[PDB]
């Protein structure tokens, strides 16, 4: 049951936009809302509006009086001397709650005229006609106007609606909540050479009487929220999908072949999401818009998605096809379960984010294989346990503070830190995988189909929300639908992993009792760490003995420590028979390293990742080597690679080398075995016999049979030896001689890989392989032996580093004339120049990176150069570079770059709270408090980034370096 | 508490079965007055009264075991009860040799393996009681006499 927090119900909204002026960056328009009051004596009506100048408001064609105030413009007063962050977080939460449409509130308060009170008490319709104007919007709708001359279509100027969550208040007045569903009528009067893309279906396109402008009329009969309404106006090249004909793809001019190749996969994504769920795609059209200077890499609205043009690749670009493919896939998953089925509160957001991430993981499983699915699930679980042990924990479904261990309030999406938002979505889809583990996948897809079918029977009624609230899901409704389809309720699993905000830590060690033939496990939990919680459920453990692989369920109550499980025979060591594996197959194992008295080959605690856990198991090194070689699970091979770094014995070198030589191993395991072999080789110097590690293996796999030092000409058509070939010198460059310097046998090998590179014969580009070669050249740089702080001059230039510097100069200059893909070699060469500057080789001068960060280099070039400037101002304690970065945060045209500068200055801070630095003035505290209070008031993501930066630099209390 | 329901099969003469079938498929409570089933304190004898006409009944044991299976979707079936008795209307006499379906006829005689059945233990208990209430007992395995 859904009861509105608003005293009115909104039925229909007309959004008309005229006079989109690109020179002056200005729009004019009106908005006409059709509300039905649910309570009599409505009097004031409270709507949401930011940055719009409200000209006049007429209610039922009668002139009404409005008052506007935004408390989130300046959160705390300018003349308050408070400088602690808890004060700002409480004031910011109160300010966002005072404009919240999820309460009854709002920023624009319109007073109902007196003569309509007899029209409002007996509950009859009210039609509110606001007309407004955006004069020059800061972060409302992004105007990308290039400075080439010509007409606005000839120079490539466009507008798009940017922002996250409820940010539609930034460009027209609305009820900007996900729970106020209404039908829509959208008119946009644009130039005759431009096209206006928006939500709904385009009913017509009429000309103006001078035929210089045309009006696009859109209609949206599926009741969506105001937060799902978008807009993209530009000189877009239109491409109808040749497979599905209601899907149109819009790109920027001169990028039509890239659009043709890139969006050619999307019909398979449509077919997948419509056959695992049994509902068809709910909207009547689908539109993909590719734009410049995007807010996020992929945004999903109702019947529309806005991607950045940096996803567009051609047919000869690999290492970008899977990333763009999965961006399209998660936009479509959010089309199904973020835009059609919406949110009932700010709680129950974990339901939608979990269903979107879970069905996108099912797509990844079918498309890229079960092994890529397991690797992705393991990397998300590691990312979560790292974040939750780092700071507090992520709390899905809080109850309204519920989480007081962290420096922001979780009551609203616009007060969350961006890393918390990312980890929120990540934990939501892993908890949905856990619900699939308890209640099987076919029942899970039946739950999702039951939600979609209720929403689509709801979506066709005309009753103003008598039935339109069946399109809003809640937690209680989701659990009730689960209990309807399965008969089991998941309330212990919901109580543990949703309502409780923690992950578990397992420390395991075993001992084999030879007398009674049992395996005594010893599993203890660390439940006193700040991020942890105590697990009391069951726990699966998989033991591989000589007779095969056996699963055991252990009951781990609070007082439990020793778990005795039984062991089988050892009669497959009496005769040589094959040892049967986890799957149905069996292999020949070399049992010379195994103990004579124990049959068990390896043990895995929680193999299926059925809890949110971090396992620290203490096996013997031969058990880790057997688990690396003969396991049929990629997460166990990865964890054995990760645990073999502590055992540098030559049997582990043989194990990793046998993994590296082995095709029919998953390629991301061999790419990890490269770096593990490099670390082991560095640890057993003065024992290593022959050549450096992986060199003979590289010449055996990727070089000519007649010439060992000449590499084969590039043929990248295998896509697994391409990735292994481009990752093996990067790990090989981490080799170090007893003198702690990279050997001149590996550096010469990398330089010969660079010289003899011929790419005139493959059908794929070479930009990522050459960029990884520059990364391998950067990995070999050891710190220089400066004497008496000698100025870095030609005489003290290392003879090794002169070759590296010549190569990166040649590569960067050739990129200036023949540019690659993603300026990947520019990014790699800027990263390598920063590596050479971090050691004492090149003079520590930020002027090169400051010229590449000037608004104009690839956004990738820009963020690489700004990363180099952030690293410089951390190491050299530069005041003027920090003022340069803070000025670039305040006034840069691209808001993604501002968010990225705040993000990089949070990750690599110039000082922490513990450090005494010269940069801890009262002036810097006043600048950052002014940046939290004012200055970042227009983005909701810059303000949370400024809160994160103030927390990283000065902590939760009063800045110490202050009177 | 819950008590398992006890379902049995009622066999009627064919004309009376047709009248009872028509009255059941009609669905009125008029059938409730018409058809009655008396059960006698023998436990294996009764009257079924169709339209107030008395018919003589015997509750017999069926050779196979039937099970009623209900369903909501006609794909998954849930067992509701076990049927083993039939009140045919018109000890060894209370045992039915045939099964309800056409292929199962003379099942007890032909399609049933002759597992030895011993009822017999009760007679042995009575003999033990006559023993324990005596004073002197004399026994001999005998021959023809």
């Amino acid at each position: 049951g859904f009861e509105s927090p608003r005293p009115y119900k909104l039925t229909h909204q007309v959004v008309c936009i005229n006079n989109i002026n690109f020179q002056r960056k200005s729009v004019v328009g009106f908005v006409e809302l059709t509300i039905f009051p649910t309570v009599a004596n409505l009097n004031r009506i409270k709507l949401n509006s930011k940055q719009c100048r409200i000209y006049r408001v007429r209610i039922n064609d009668l002139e009404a009086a409005f008052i506007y105030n935004d408390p989130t413009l300046e959160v705390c007063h300018s003349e308050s001397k408070q400088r602690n962050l808890n004060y700002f977080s409480n004031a910011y939460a109160a300010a966002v709650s005072a404009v919240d449409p999820d309460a009854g509130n709002g920023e624009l308060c319109i007073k109902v005229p007196s003569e309509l009170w007899k029209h409002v008490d007996e509950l009859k319709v009210l039609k509110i006609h606001i007309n407004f104007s955006l004069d020059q919007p800061k972060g409302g709708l992004h105007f990308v106007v290039p400075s080439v001359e010509g007409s606005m279509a000839e120079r490539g100027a466009h507008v798009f609606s940017c922002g996250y969550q409820n940010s539609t208040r930034f460009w027209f007045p609305c009820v900007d909540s996900y729970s106020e569903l209404c039908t829509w009528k959208l008119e946009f009067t644009v130039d005759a050479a431009m096209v206006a893309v928006s939500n709904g279906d385009l009913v017509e396109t009429v000309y103006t009487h001078d035929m210089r402008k045309k009006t696009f009329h859109y209609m949206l009969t599926i009741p969506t929220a105001a937060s799902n309404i978008s807009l993209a106006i530009g000189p877009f090249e239109i491409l109808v999908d040749p497979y599905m004909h209601e899907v149109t793809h819009f790109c920027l001019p001169q990028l039509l072949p890239l659009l043709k190749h890139t969006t050619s996969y999307l019909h398979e994504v449509f077919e997948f999401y419509e056959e695992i769920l049994t509902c068809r795609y709910p909207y009547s059209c689908f539109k993909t818009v590719f734009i410049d200077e995007a807010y996020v890499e992929v945004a999903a609205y109702a019947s529309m998605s806005i991607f950045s043009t940096n996803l567009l690749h051609s047919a000869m670009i690999i290492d970008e096809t899977p990333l763009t493919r999965r961006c399209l896939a998660q936009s479509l998953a959010q089309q199904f379960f973020g835009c059609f089925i919406s949110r009932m509160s700010w709680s129950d957001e974990w339901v939608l984010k979990g269903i979107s991430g879970y069905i996108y993981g099912l797509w990844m499983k079918k498309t890229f294989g079960v092994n890529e699915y397991r690797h992705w699930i393991k990397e998300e679980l590691d990312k979560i346990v790292a974040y939750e042990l780092k700071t507090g924990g992520v709390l899905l479904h809080p109850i309204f503070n519920p989480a007081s261990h962290l420096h922001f309030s979780i009551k609203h999406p616009h007060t969350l830190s961006w890393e918390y938002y990312s980890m929120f979505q990540c934990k939501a889809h892993l908890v949905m995988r856990l619900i699939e583990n308890r209640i099987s996948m076919e029942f899970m897809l039946q739950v999702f189909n039951k939600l979609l079918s209720l929403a689509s029977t709801a979506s066709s009624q005309k009753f103003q929300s008598h039935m339109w609230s069946q399109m809003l899901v809640s937690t209680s409704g989701f659990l009730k639908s689960i209990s309807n389809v399965s008969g089991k309720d998941i309330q212990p699993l919901i109580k543990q992993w949703v309502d409780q905000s923690g992950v578990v830590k397992f420390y395991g060690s075993f001992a084999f009792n030879r007398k009674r033939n049992v395996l005594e496990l010893e599993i203890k939990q660390d439940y006193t760490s700040p991020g942890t919680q105590k697990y009391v459920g069951p726990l699966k453990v998989t033991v591989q003995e000589l007779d095969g692989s056996f699963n055991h369920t252990l009951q781990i109550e609070e007082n439990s420590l020793k778990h005795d499980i039984p062991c089988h025979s050892k009669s497959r060591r009496n005769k040589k028979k094959k040892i049967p594996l986890m799957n149905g197959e069996e292999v020949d194992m070399d049992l010379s390293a195994m103990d004579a008295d124990s049959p068990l080959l390896w043990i895995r605690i929680d193999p299926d990742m059925s809890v949110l856990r971090k396992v620290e198991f203490e096996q013997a090194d031969f058990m880790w080597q057997y688990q690396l070689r003969y396991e049929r699970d990629v997460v166990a091979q990865q964890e054995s690679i990760l645990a073999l770094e502590k055992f540098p014995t030559p049997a582990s070198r043989l194990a990793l080398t046998d993994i590296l030589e082995q095709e029919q191993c998953f390629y991301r395991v061999r790419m990890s075995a490269c770096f593990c072999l490099a670390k082991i080789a560095n640890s057993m110097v003065s024992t290593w016999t022959g050549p450096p590690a992986m060199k003979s293996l590289f010449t055996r796999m990727f070089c000519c049979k007649s010439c060992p030092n000449i590499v084969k000409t590039n043929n990248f058509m295998s896509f697994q030896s391409y990735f292994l070939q481009k990752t093996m010198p990067v790990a090989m460059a981490l080799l170090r001689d007893v003198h702690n310097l990279c050997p001149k046998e590996v550096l010469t090998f990398i330089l010969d890989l660079i010289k003899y590179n011929d790419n005139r014969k493959n059908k794929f580009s070479d930009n990522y392989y050459r960029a990884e070669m520059i990364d391998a050249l950067a990995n070999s740089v050891t710190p220089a032996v400066s004497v008496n702080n000698e100025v870095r001059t030609l005489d003290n230039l290392n003879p090794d580093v002169r070759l590296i510097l010549e190569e990166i100069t040649r590569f960067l200059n050739m990129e200036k004339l023949l540019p690659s893909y993603r300026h990947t070699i520019t990014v790699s060469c800027l990263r390598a120049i920063r590596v050479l500057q971090k050691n004492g080789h090149v003079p520590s001068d930020p002027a090169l990176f400051k010229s590449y960060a000037e608004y104009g280099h690839f956004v990738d070039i820009r963020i690489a150069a700004l990363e180099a400037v952030v690293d410089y101002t951390k190491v050299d304690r530069s005041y003027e570079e920090l003022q340069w970065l803070l000025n670039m945060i305040q006034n840069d045209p691209v808001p993604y770059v501002r968010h990225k500068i705040l993000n990089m200055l949070t990750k690599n801070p110039p000082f922490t709270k513990n450090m005494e630095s010269p940069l801890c003035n009262e002036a810097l505290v006043d600048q950052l408090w002014k940046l939290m209070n004012s200055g970042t008031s227009h983005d909701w993501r810059l303000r949370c980034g400024a809160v994160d930066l103030y927390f990283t630099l000065f902590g939760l209390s009063r800045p110490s370096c202050l009177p | 508490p819950h008590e398992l329901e006890s379902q049995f099969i009622l066999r009627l003469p064919p004309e009376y079965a047709s009248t009872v079938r028509r009255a059941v498929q009609s669905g009125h409570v008029n059938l409730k007055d018409r058809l009655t089933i008396e059960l006698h304190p023998d436990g294996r004898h009764g009257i079924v009264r169709v339209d107030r006409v008395p018919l003589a009944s015997k509750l017999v044991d069926l050779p196979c075991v039937m099970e009623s299976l209900k369903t909501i979707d006609k794909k998954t079936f849930y067992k509701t009860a076990d049927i083993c008795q039939m009140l045919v209307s018109t000890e060894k006499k209370f045992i039915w040799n045939h099964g309800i379906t056409l292929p199962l006829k003379n099942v007890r005689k032909r399609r049933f393996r002759k597992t030895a059945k011993k009822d017999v233990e009760k007679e042995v208990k009575r003999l033990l009681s006559t023993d324990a209430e005596a004073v002197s007992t004399r026994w001999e395995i005998i021959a023809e006499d």
């Binding site: 309807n484 008969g487 | 009622l10 009655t36 008396e38 304190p41 299976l69 003379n106």
Partner: protein, 454 residues
Amino acid sequence: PWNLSNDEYYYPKIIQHSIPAVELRQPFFPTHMGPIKLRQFHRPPLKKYSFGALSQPGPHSVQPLLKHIKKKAKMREQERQASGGGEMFFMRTPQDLTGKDGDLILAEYSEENGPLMMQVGMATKIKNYYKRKPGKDPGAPDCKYGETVYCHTSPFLGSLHPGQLLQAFENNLFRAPIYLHKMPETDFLIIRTRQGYYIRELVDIFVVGQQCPLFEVPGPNSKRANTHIRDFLQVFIYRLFWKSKDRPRRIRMEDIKKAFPSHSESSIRKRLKLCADFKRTGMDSNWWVLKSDFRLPTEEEIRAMVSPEQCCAYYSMIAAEQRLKDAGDDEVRTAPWNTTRAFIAAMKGKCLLEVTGVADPTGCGEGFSYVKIPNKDADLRRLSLKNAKQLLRKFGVPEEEIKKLSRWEVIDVVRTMSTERFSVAEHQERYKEECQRIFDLQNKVLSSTEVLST
């Protein structure tokens, strides 16, 4: 841009009972069965009521349930369409397991005492195994009940003919071929309760062939038998502690002695040793209270302790124990622990079964028997073949043996006369062909709507 997961090297290639059944309620799953209740196992007599409407003898008006059946079916369809329209789980109460609603079929058994048999409240599925014809086939003959599956590898002992659909009961206990027959014309189903008689018609009755057991019945005094005995007692004790209303939870010993009266009270004492303490002292004077440190297990842990199929295997064992005990080695072979062990071992390929024997539940040539069977001159050297050929001609040996010239058998036959086929493929092939012929004849007889004379 492709799969790139070497999946062929890492990975080279269901029954939901009612909530009264998985919770092991005593009416449906009895704690103790006496001798007269073990002789009437799965044949429950018609009991006389002491109190109720049927306890007073005389004309007991029987009742129609037509309106009840269609009202309950319409109500369940409303529940299913309110829950999103998918497939739902309905059997959540004991009152869901009545015969008064839903589509009832009957299922008759061919054997007198099967090795395994379902209790009341347990679920089973109907699978229609259909072997396609060689090359082109129209499609499975459609069937009213069950789901169709295409079986290249015959589940049963014989193999399906091309184009032959065979229905079967499939659950965790057994798998058995069933044959749909129409009901007799004068047979209706009377459901009697304490309140009155109720009548349904039946139209569908299956005949269930010889079961193929999938669960092994334990033997008497086995380790699995005694494990079940104490596990069942522990589950009953935990569910009595859950039902207790006092805090801390307390039970009485003679409730357990009423449920399990054959148990010595020492066994019950030990099951109460861990998890309860006799509070003789004033605090709950003389009460078997739950220990304060003991965490009573949740519902899913108690369900994971004992399975309903283990209870059915135990009931089969104790019923067969009673029948053997009443009838004073051939009978011991026909005991379900032996036959279930034999069939499951034959399905792994350990051993073979003599398909004609004494464990045959028919007593004639129809049906199988599941008992385990073994899985598997001086001058004659100078005869030098040609003269041995002439000698075999002289003795009157038939020309086939003379013709083979394979002397492996020739001189052995000249030795046999002067005194006067491979099991690997051979035996297995012969057993399979005999089983297939027997199965086809049995299916035709057991699917014939032909009237059989009394």
